[PDB]
Amino acid sequence: RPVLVLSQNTKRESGRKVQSGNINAAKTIADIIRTCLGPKSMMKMLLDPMGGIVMTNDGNAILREIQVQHPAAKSMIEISRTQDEEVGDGTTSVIILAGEMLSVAEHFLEQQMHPTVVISAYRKALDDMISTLKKISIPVDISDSDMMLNIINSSITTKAISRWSSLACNIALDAVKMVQFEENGRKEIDIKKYARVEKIPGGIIEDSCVLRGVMINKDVTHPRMRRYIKNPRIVLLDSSLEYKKGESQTDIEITREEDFTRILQMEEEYIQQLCEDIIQLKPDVVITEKGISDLAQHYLMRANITAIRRVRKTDNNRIARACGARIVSRPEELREDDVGTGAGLLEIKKIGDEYFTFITDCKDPKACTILLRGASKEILSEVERNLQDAMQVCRNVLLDPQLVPGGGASEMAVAHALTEKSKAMTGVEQWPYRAVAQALEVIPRTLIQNCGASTIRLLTSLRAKHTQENCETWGVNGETGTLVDMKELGIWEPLAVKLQTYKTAVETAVLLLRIDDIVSGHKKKG
């Protein structure tokens, strides 16, 4: 009956209402995780739709479990994920900053200022923020292990693992240092692939350690295999050690009596030939990503060789990195180079009620396994998240050795510098510039709020202190609510984290400011 231009379910709204809704949604997203910032933050309990429980105080972990309908909140969640993936830290800070800049932009949008002017002012302020951050930074001697440990500690004082700080810092530093690789003139760290974190519930957290090798959840295929080898020689394979069909259709035609027996004998002889090819290199351990036949097990064991089968490809790559081996598909092409010498011990021991394979005495290994042992699964997941944050911070510092004062000192200094710069523009865009400059004070403000101290008095004192000459390192003590210089407290952040936080927050503000129309309801049309 009715005739329409667009579809019936296509709903469109535009005007000041859309901007107000976007800014309100961003402020709501910021308020969700506002109290999860600082050393005195409180954890949150998240219930998964699958029935699982996430108990954490990380910005990205909290935000990725929230389902929202407003596309502005979806944008903010994507911002959180981007910050988490790019640098690994500052996830709550970027969300809070984006919310604050969007609020101070809404203030101007209420008046008759076009959003494009606000966006231009925001971009200019972002450039000046980058300049100030690069100016107030300090170098770091990466050789000094104590300084690196202090940096990691300052990174993890705000997490639940802070009670065991020396252990976690040493674990992260050792893992990052020994996963470092440099081949063909290319330097890589690769925390994602190598340096796997394996968590086993039970035990005590102080028993956790980083292994000089790789531990996998596998057991020997046969009981008579040796479960403890002093200096094993390890061979890694992809192809199965069992007789398998070919690709082509290869039906046989048996007419003589002995052909069936001959086929079976040839299958056994092929298995024996593969095992002899393996044995010719004189190894002690054979690891296969696929199955190993029982006859293959017998032939390997006749040469006193421990065999483990059905290992994941990632685990095999990690073992190859750790023990200096090379994965070989066809056993007949095995060479002396492919055999992995360098493992200093291999042991299959029992933890709880399950067997675990340890290769934990490698000399100069390029891969490691972090063995987490805690109260339960959720505690171990939180510990793993905190360790990931620490390792990301360590890698960021190693790539860029620049350092920046923490606890809001850098932000207050940048805000003061930007205000002093704005004292000379004498234009019409100076007001958004100064507003977004002062919007950086939200994180010192929320630090004070979480500490429980008086926000107004402490913020006024800090702002007055930053007006002096050499006071760029004066911040707020997160757990006592006092103004302390951060060359004494020692809280410092990598420059990369701060740069990424500012850039991402300002660009999120720009992206959500450039929008004044929302159309929804149309089908994907695909």
Partner: protein
């Protein structure tokens, strides 16, 4: 002790890390003719799974989360949900047939599971329903940065 399925735990752990961007939600069909013109539409070579449920009945949210995980892991399949009352099922369906797994392939049914609580449970995991669906061969056989896809003029050289 092969019945314990030691690989089930590692499969669940790998499924927990399914996707980075978002968990995504199961599409909710709002009308009958919408149901008709989505089952009839789309390629016939893809399997479309339809979820039948009513609010409040137990044994539902677990399989909602299971389908969420399956859609996260499987981009090909078209898991979707629709209210039982919206379609207009009879009293017997609304009293003893709430768990219904409607599977479409080629425009016609190939899987018609109903009353799956006994064969699945009440708080079953994703792997359990995945194996149950795999029992009848119902499952068809890298991570980009964000995206890659950007006339037909490609390139030439001097000529």
């Amino acid at each position: 002790f092969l019945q314990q399925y030691r690989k089930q735990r590692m499969e669940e752990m790998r499924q927990q890390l399914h996707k980075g961007p978002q968990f995504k939600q199961v599409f909710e069909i709002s009308s009958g003719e919408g149901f008709l013109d989505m089952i009839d539409k789309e390629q016939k070579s893809i399997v479309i799974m339809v979820h039948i449920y009513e609010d409040g009945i137990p044994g539902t949210e677990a399989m909602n989360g299971c389908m969420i995980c399956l859609a996260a892991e499987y981009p090909a399949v078209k898991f979707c949900k629709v209210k039982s009352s919206v379609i207009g099922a009879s009293s017997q369906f609304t009293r003893n047939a709430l768990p219904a797994l409607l599977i479409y392939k080629g425009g016609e049914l190939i899987g018609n599971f109903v009353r799956v609580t006994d064969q699945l449970g009440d708080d079953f995991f994703a792997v359990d329903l995945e194996a149950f669906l795999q029992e009848f061969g119902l499952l068809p056989e890298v991570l980009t940065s964000v995206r890659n896809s950007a006339s037909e003029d490609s390139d030439l050289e001097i000529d």
